[PDB]
Design a protein around this ligand. Structure first.
Ligand SMILES: [Ca+2]
Ligand code: NA
Length: 117
């Protein structure tokens, strides 16, 4: 399908993979950025279903969701168990979603909210 970068600057919102909760497209390199005002911190909560194609022995060899908080890597995620809720201590988050050439997985969706410092 697509995948231009997306930018979210409201105090809360939803972010999901393309066509959620139907299969996300292959060969994606998607960048989602959240930028809110200094003195707010971002909290991320994934919803169910969460389904990124995985592998029984290799960590995330096929498709990957990577999360950055002000440039620092705070996790790479795949599989069927959603990540735990993330308190990022940051006003700047980036999610990078990479997908390979095949598979039918339902993808991911999160809600972010902001905490007042
Ligand atoms: Ca795949
Ligand atoms: Na999807």
């Amino acid at each position: 399908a697509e995948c231009s970068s997306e930018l979210y600057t409201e105090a809360s919102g939803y972010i999901s993979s393309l066509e959620y909760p139907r299969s996300y497209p292959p060969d994606l390199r998607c960048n989602y950025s959240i930028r809110v005002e200094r003195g707010l911190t971002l909290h991320l909560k994934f919803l169910e279903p969460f389904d990124i194609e995985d592998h029984p022995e290799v960590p995330c060899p096929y498709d990957q969701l990577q999360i950055y908080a002000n440039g620092k890597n705070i996790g790479e995620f795949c599989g069927k168990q959603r990540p735990p809720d993330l308190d990022t201590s940051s006003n700047a988050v980036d999610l990078l979603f990479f997908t390979d050439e095949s598979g039918d997985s339902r993808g991911w969706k999160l809600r972010y909210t902001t905490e007042i410092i």
